[PDB]
C-alpha cells in the first residue's frame, strides 16, 4: 500500500506567495542590471521557494562572472546542493581551486556556460586536466565553430594557436575539420596528404569529422569508409561515435556496430539506445545469450522506446496494470498543505484565473522544486494531487520519476478524452497515437508555447495553422483555443501522413521537422521503423519520434485497443 506520509514544510498564505511572485520578474531583471542591493532585498526573506532558488542561481552566475567572490560565497551557502545550477557549481569549484569535476566536464566537446568554460581553462592553466581529454575538447570546439573557446583552451594548455607547437597544428587542421571545409569534395584527400605528420589523436578525430558529416547527410557508404580510418575511436566526440554506430546500423553491419559500441564511453554504452542495438547486433550474429542479457539491461532502463522494444525481444508485452494502489484522498489533501507543494498550487491556480503564462511556468518550477527528492510514495501522492488540481503536466512529471512503483494512469494521463477521441476519429487517425503526440508536445498544457512559437496542446506553428485553416475552412486564430488546436493538430497528423506514403513513423517525423525533411531521410531501400527513427539527422526530431511512438504504445495498451507491439507500430518505412 502507498505510504500516507506527506511532508509538512512551513506554509505561507496565498497572498504572500502571490506577493513574492509579484516581484520575481523584477528580481530577475535586477540580476541582469547587476543591482545587487535589489537582489539581496528580494531574497532576504523570500520563502524557501523555487523563486528564491532561481533568483539566487542567476545572481550567482552574475557574481561569478563579476568575481564578487565574497558575496558569491555567502550566497552559494544558501543554495541546496540539489538546486545548484551547473555553471554555479563551476564558479564555486573554481573559487575553491577544486578541479575534480573538471575531469568529467572536459569530456564534453561542445559549448559550455561561461563559468564551466573558465573552470576548464583554469584547470588547464594549472596542469590538472587530462591532456588527451583536453586536446579532444579543443578539437571538438574547433569542429563546433567555437573558435574562441578552442583558442582560449589551447592557450590555457600552454600551446596557443600562434605559438608554433601543437596548438598551431590543431588550428591548421581547420582546413579539414572546419564546418565548411569538411564538406569539401577534397576533404579526405587533403587529410590523407597531410596525414603522415599528424598525431594519432589528430588523425582519428579528423577522420571522425569527415565520417560524421557524411553520416548525418545519410551517405552511409561514404561515412563508413571515413569512420573505418579512425584508428583510436576514443578520440571521437560523443556525436561522432554515435553517428558511426548509426551508419553501421543503417547498413546492417552488425559486427561493426557492436565493435563501435564497445569503444563508446561507458555512459553511452549504458543508454537504452546502445544497450538495445548492441543486443540486436548480438542476436543477429547468433550470440543469443549475450543478446538476452543486454535486452534485460535495456528493459530495466524503464518506460522508454528501447526498453519496450527490448522487452518485446524477450517476449514481454507492455502491461499497463498499476502495481501500486491509487493514492488515498486524505494523503492527497495533506500533500496540498505542504508549504512547498502549496506554493506551486497557488501559483498554478492563479495563473489560470489571471491568465498569466509566466506565472504558470513558475508554478512548474515550484512543483519540481517541491517534489525534488520525494521518495516514490510521495511522488505518487503528489502526482494525484497535481491531477486533482488540473495541473496535468506536473502529475506526469511526478509519476514518471518513480522506478519501481508504477502508476500508468498517472504517467499516461488522458484528459480531454471525449474531445481528442472525436477529432482523431474525424480524420481517421489512431487516438493512441494522438495522445502519445500530445504527451510529448505539451504534456497536456493547453497554453503551452515553445521558443519558436509552436502553440497549444499539439504545438502547431502559427504559420502551419494558416495553411491548415485555409484548407479546412477554419479561422487561423482557432489555433489558440483547445478545441481548435486539437482539430488542427489531428488534421495535420492525417495530412502529413497522406503526403508521406501513409506511414505513421514518417508522419511523426514530418509533424516535427516538416514532411519535406522526413521524406529526405528515407532510404532507397525500406527501413525498419526504429532504424529510420534512430538515424534521423535532427536530434530534436530523432528524440521526438521515439518518445511519441513509445507514448503511443503505452496509450494503446491503456485504452484496451487491439494489441500492436511497438516493433510493428514502427513497421517498415518505405523506400523513396
Ligand atoms: C504541427 C506543426 O506546426 N509542425 C511544424 C513544425 O512544428 C514543430 C516545431 C517544434 C518546436 O517548437 N521545437 C522547439 C520546442 S522547445 O521550446 O525547444 O521545447 N514543435 C512543432 C511540432 O512538432 O515545424 C516544422 C518546421 O518548421 C514545420 O514543417 S514545415 O512547414 O515543412 O516547415 C511543421 O509544419
Ligand atoms: Mg516540447
Ligand atoms: Mg542536430
Author numbering: 17 to 592
Provide the authors' original text about this structure.
To evaluate the potential of bulgecin A as a broad-spectrum inhibitor for Lts, we solved the high-resolution crystal structures of the membrane bound Lt (LtgA) from the Neisseria species in complex with bulgecin A. The near atomic resolution structure of the LtgA-bulgecin A complex shows the complete structure of bulgecin A supported by a well-defined solvent model that clearly shows highly conserved residues interacting directly with bulgecin A and those that are engaged via water mediated interactions. Bulgecin A consists of a 4-O-sulfonyl-N-acetylglucosamine moiety that is linked by a β 1-4 glycosidic linkage to a 4-hydroxy-5-(hydroxymethyl)-l-proline that terminates with a taurine (N-linked sulfur) moiety. Bulgecin A is bound in the region of the active site defined as subsite −1, −2, −3, and partially occludes subsite +1. In the active site of LtgA, chitopentaose and bulgecin A have overlapping binding sites. This strongly suggests that bulgecin A could be competitive with the PG glycan strand. In subsite −2, the GlcNAc residue forms direct hydrogen bonds with the side chains of Y532 and T504 and with the main chain of M501 and Y551. In subsite −1, the hydroxyl-methyl of the proline is directly hydrogen bonded to the OE2 of the catalytic residue E481 and the ND2 of N552. The taurine group of the inhibitor is directly hydrogen bonded to S490 and E580. The OS1 and OS2 of the sulphonated portion of the taurine is directly hydrogen bonded to the main chain and side chain of R491. Bulgecin A appears to mimic the oxocarbonium intermediate step in the predicted mechanism of Lts and is most likely competitive with the glycan strand of the PG.
